[PDB]
Design a binder for this molecule. Structure first.
Ligand SMILES: *[C@@H]1O[C@H](CO)[C@@H](O)[C@H](O)[C@H]1NC(C)=O
Ligand SMILES: O=C(O)CN(CC(=O)O)CC(=O)O
Ligand SMILES: [Bi+3]
Ligand SMILES: [Fe+3]
Length: 679
């Protein structure tokens, strides 16, 4: 072990004093092979951000506004440790900015113009920056000076700390706009009282503000929340009806070489020795020198930020949109009004080439973005860099936990009424070679497995779910001797059978030849003992239908299916010999893009679907015909979902529990990140 010092950045002489006490008390209880603190004193939060980027410091705790500023070039900082504020069993790392109104006041979010508004204070986050950022494009021009545009948007307001001389209407509800607690409508409790008293029609406040100023649910039922989709929901449903979800206080560090593990090691040790009510000699969350030095006085401890989290993901799509609007002070030109370009997310260069062709044929209505993993693509849809992609049910689940919604299903059964007929799903199966007569589902231990990719339905969740129920541990790489399960940790025995070159080895994309249904079947033919795939994989790749050299000579009847009862059946007897049902793949998008995506794709499939006779020369959306590029190759159409518009309602209770039973065996860094934000 070499250097274990975290250089903490302080922003004032008082912080610098507390940091020094922090270093001293840690040196007295932590041994020499443990973490230590060093203190660098700067003059502002921005100077700390700059110093960290320039490798002169390592850590500083920031409000969300500065976490945003810290992420921008050329700082490139990321969140690494979170302060939490509730119980250790119910940590409250985030608040929810909300718009509270009285029940039955008869207006939605898109009708806030002409209303009386209550704010916590000018330039405050929940009470100003967030709602004003979100309303920005609805404000009348000129939008700056901002206070003037807002004063013209609302009929009257309380905005503490605002200039009452230049902008009198901002003070109508609190004459003088007193920047202090002597004003009854100042701050969180004050802005809520402004609403409670009938002075304002809407208060912009934290979700916690309501819960701490009202005794009861009966009290809370007298109020409502404004949702971004122009509906109202009960106050208790703030998780589903907020303006933005916002981290309270975040330790940030360099994106590269930032010492995140050491920063957590330090802070995890500090909260154990000197955290809430732990020590009398030193307190992490108080000080004789003042409030909120280094960390907030209301903090109860720290939680580690999941590694896959970047600032955009951490702050959330809603918060980023608001702050960008305010920071750059410029609007895209309304109306216009048009949905047009859906940005499709393609998985690496193989999918990107089919997507490119689609884009040119769609004539402006489809555009393309690339990422190297499904999870990177899902992250791109979350942050707004992409809008849609099709997904295996396993990744529909992950996407759903990440707040995405299914809009249309891939359908596989040919029918005169494809678009309007929901399918129960395909079958997950375990394929083996007939000549390998020994193999039974009863004992697959010490054998070699081939999987579409980790996290996928037929390739992973179903069979590994069933395996986990039998052996009751997650070490599937010890159960099997070796295999190919693309997406596995690189030193895992479940990467040893994969065929990709160099850095492509075991990657979950088509640069890895054993990725996906066809690839998993190839793996079985060449190296493996069992393949976990869909029921149609074998016939799609046998009898000369796959013309590639490895598949050319393969016969359907040389393969069998493993049944659950320990017997074997031929390939076409999948209906009586399968592991489980598998919900169809589906297109997912942001809740705010659901309608435009639904519209565009229905139009798109009408032009490039199954209606096209000659698929040579004309563009076909549903053909690869080997690698399931963009959509599965056996896709007949994209089907309506009607009310099956959430991941839980789409996938069904049966498959949702199954994946949840595997929650402990999850290597998915994206899922860890999403469930940290929404547990
Ligand atoms: C699709 O497949 C199922 C089961 O194989 C079959 O019963 C059904 O008739 C097919 N048609 C439709 C429209 O789902
Ligand atoms: O609103 C602000 O500007 C102050 N801080 C936190 C605080 O001081 O409570 C940002 C926030 O509320 O996220
Ligand atoms: Bi605040
Ligand atoms: Fe699948």
């Amino acid at each position: 072990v070499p250097d274990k010092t975290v250089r903490w950045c302080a922003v004032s002489e008082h912080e610098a004093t507390k940091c020094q006490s922090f270093r001293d008390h840690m040196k007295s209880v932590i041994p020499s092979d443990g973490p230590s603190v060093a203190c660098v004193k700067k003059a502002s939060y921005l100077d700390c951000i700059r110093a960290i980027a320039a490798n002169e410091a390592d850590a500083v705790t920031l409000d969300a506004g500065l976490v945003y500023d810290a992420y921008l070039a050329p700082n490139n900082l990321k969140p690494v440790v979170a302060e939490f504020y509730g119980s250790k069993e119910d940590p409250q790392t985030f608040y929810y900015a909300v718009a509270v109104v009285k029940k039955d006041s008869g207006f939605q979010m898109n009708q806030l113009r002409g209303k009386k508004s209550c704010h916590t204070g000018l330039g405050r986050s929940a009470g100003w920056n967030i709602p004003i950022g979100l309303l920005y494009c609805d404000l009348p021009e000129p939008r700056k000076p901002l206070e003037k545009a807002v004063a013209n948007f609302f009929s009257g307001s309380c905005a503490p700390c605002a200039d009452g001389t230049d902008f009198p209407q901002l003070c109508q509800l609190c004459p003088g706009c007193g920047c202090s607690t002597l004003n009854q409508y100042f701050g969180y409790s004050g802005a809520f009282k402004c609403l409670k008293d009938g002075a304002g029609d809407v208060a912009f406040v934290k979700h916690s503000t309501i819960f701490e100023n009202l005794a009861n649910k009966a009290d809370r039922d007298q109020y409502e929340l404004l949702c971004l989709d122009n509906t109202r929901k009960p106050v208790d449903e703030y998780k589903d009806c907020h303006l933005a979800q916002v981290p309270s206080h975040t330790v940030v560090a360099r994106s590269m070489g930032g010492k995140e593990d050491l920063i957590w090691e330090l802070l995890n040790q500090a909260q154990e020795h000197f955290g809430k009510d732990k020590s009398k000699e030193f307190q992490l969350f108080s000080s004789p020198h003042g409030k909120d030095l280094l960390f907030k006085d209301s903090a109860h401890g720290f939680l580690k930020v999941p590694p896959r989290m970047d600032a955009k993901m951490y702050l959330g799509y809603e918060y980023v949109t608001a702050i960008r609007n305010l920071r750059e002070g410029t609007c895209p030109e309304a109306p216009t009004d048009e949905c047009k370009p859906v940005k499709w997310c393609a998985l690496s260069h193989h999918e990107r080439l089919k997507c490119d062709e689609w884009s040119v044929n769609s004539v402006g209505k489809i555009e393309c973005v690339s990422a190297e993993t499904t999870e990177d693509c899902i992250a791109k849809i979350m942050n707004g860099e992409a809008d849609a992609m099709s997904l295996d049910g396993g990744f529909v689940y992950i996407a759903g936990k990440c707040g995405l919604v299914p809009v249309l299903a891939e359908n596989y059964n040919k029918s005169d009424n494809c678009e309007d007929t929901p399918e129960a799903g395909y079958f997950a199966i375990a394929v083996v070679k007939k000549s390998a007569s020994d193999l039974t589902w009863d004992n697959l231990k010490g054998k070699k497995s081939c999987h579409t990719a980790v996290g996928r339905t037929a390739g992973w969740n179903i069979p590994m779910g069933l395996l986990y129920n039998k052996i009751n541990h997650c070490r599937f790489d010890e159960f099997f001797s070796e295999g190919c399960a693309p997406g596995s940790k690189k030193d895992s025995s479940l990467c040893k059978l994969c065929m990709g070159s160099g850095l492509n080895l075991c990657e979950p994309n088509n640069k890895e030849g054993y990725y996906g249904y066809t690839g998993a079947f190839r793996c079985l033919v060449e190296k493996g003992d069992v393949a976990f795939v869909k029921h149609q994989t074998v016939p799609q790749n046998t009898g000369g239908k796959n013309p590639d050299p490895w598949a050319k000579n393969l016969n359907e009847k040389d393969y069998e299916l493993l049944c659950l009862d320990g017997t074997r059946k031929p390939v076409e007897e999948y209906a009586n010999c399968h592991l489980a049902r598998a919900p169809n793949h589906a297109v997912v998008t942001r809740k705010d893009k659901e309608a435009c995506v639904h519209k565009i794709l229905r139009q798109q499939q009408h032009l490039f679907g199954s209606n096209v006779t000659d698929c040579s020369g004309n563009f076909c959306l549903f053909r690869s015909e080997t690698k399931d590029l963009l959509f599965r190759d056996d896709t007949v159409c994209l089907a309506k979902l009607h009310d099956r518009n959430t991941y839980e309602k789409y996938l069904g209770e049966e498959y949702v529990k199954a994946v949840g039973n595997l929650r402990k065996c999850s290597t998915s860094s994206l899922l860890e990140a999403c469930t940290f934000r929404r547990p």
